[PDB]
Design an enzyme around this catalytic site. Structure first.
Site, PDB file in Angstrom:
ATOM      1  N   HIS A  86       0.814  -1.208   0.000  1.00 46.73           N
ATOM      2  CA  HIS A  86       0.000   0.000   0.000  1.00 46.73           C
ATOM      3  C   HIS A  86       0.850   1.261   0.000  1.00 46.73           C
ATOM      4  O   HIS A  86       0.379   2.321  -0.426  1.00 46.73           O
ATOM      5  CB  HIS A  86      -0.932   0.000   1.209  1.00 46.73           C
ATOM      6  N   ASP A 136      -0.787  -7.966  -0.032  1.00 46.16           N
ATOM      7  CA  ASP A 136      -0.310  -6.618   0.263  1.00 46.16           C
ATOM      8  C   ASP A 136       1.184  -6.626   0.590  1.00 46.16           C
ATOM      9  O   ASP A 136       1.607  -6.258   1.685  1.00 46.16           O
ATOM     10  CB  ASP A 136      -1.127  -6.001   1.404  1.00 46.16           C
ATOM     11  N   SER A 186       4.094   1.465   8.995  1.00 47.40           N
ATOM     12  CA  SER A 186       3.940   0.210   8.277  1.00 47.40           C
ATOM     13  C   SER A 186       5.300  -0.350   7.882  1.00 47.40           C
ATOM     14  O   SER A 186       6.202   0.388   7.477  1.00 47.40           O
ATOM     15  CB  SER A 186       3.076   0.412   7.035  1.00 47.40           C
TER      16      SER A 186
END
Lengths: 161, 161
Positions: free
Chosen positions: A39, A61, A113
């Site tokens: 992402h 992802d 992240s």
């Protein structure tokens, strides 16, 4: 004691993700693979990594790449065993209960992240993709490893960081 | 006291300009707008400010733009009054007399444009654009604020920095 070798392995296995002159995520070295959340967008701050061919999958992802041979000695060690209890993280403590990873604090923010979660021996056990605010806690949507298989857990209300 | 707060305001309210890898000038954030001398060329050391559509004025020799929302709490204070006396500067103290700003030493060098001139209370009065070596002093070609207009003072013999 654990934080010392933890931060050592972190600096030896973390490279930030640049985009438009701003940090957006982290791509980390696990085993013999560079792995990054999908992402997040940008380029990693290394000439060796920037030219690599990446395998990308949105269903999980995640992007992976083969690390160069000369950097093979600067990567962590992985595991698949998942005993219940307590684990470490770059921003403190995480808990593995009911097959779910939880942040007691709710201190997660965008740009976090890709920061790996470690075991007692320093071995990387998961990678945080996002968080979900459940009361005072944060359930962690992460990509983890079985013996041979890669799985993703995403509780409801999660958001990509 | 005054020196330290002047330095911290300058650190929080100045962004260098680099061209061909060498510093060329400075840009300052006042009120709710960033302004830079127009004659100096380069790129601001901030992707946030670099992408803003700057408005040009060759007659005033100034570029300005409206700051982003998240930088609005890191803004110096402005004023419009010019009492007679002395004022602060990153390179010392400037003397105001008869509508003329002057450096006691003539220590200004090319590439020093844009460093704001502070008042007693840290408020900005003018912005240095250029200098003129008159006698043992340097007259300042600067940009100051009226009730609602901008005025530019450029004494003869001045050179852009």
């Amino acid at each position: 004691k654990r934080e010392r070798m933890c931060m050592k392995i972190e600096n030896d296995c973390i490279f930030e993700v640049k985009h438009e002159g701003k940090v957006t995520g982290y791509a980390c070295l696990v085993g013999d693979k560079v792995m990054k959340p999908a992402h997040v967008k940008g380029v990693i701050d290394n000439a060796d990594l920037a030219k690599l061919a990446f395998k990308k999958s949105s269903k999980y992802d995640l992007e992976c790449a083969q690390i160069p041979v000369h950097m093979r000695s600067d990567a962590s060690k992985y595991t698949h065993e998942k005993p219940e209890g307590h684990y470490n993280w770059h921003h403190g403590a995480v808990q593995y209960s009911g097959g779910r990873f939880t942040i007691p604090t709710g201190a997660g923010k965008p740009g976090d992240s890709g920061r790996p979660i470690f075991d007692n021996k320093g071995r990387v056990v998961a990678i945080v993709l996002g968080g979900a605010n459940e009361g005072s806690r944060t359930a962690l949507s992460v990509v983890t490893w079985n013996k041979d298989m890669v799985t993703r857990v995403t509780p409801e209300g999660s958001e990509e960081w």
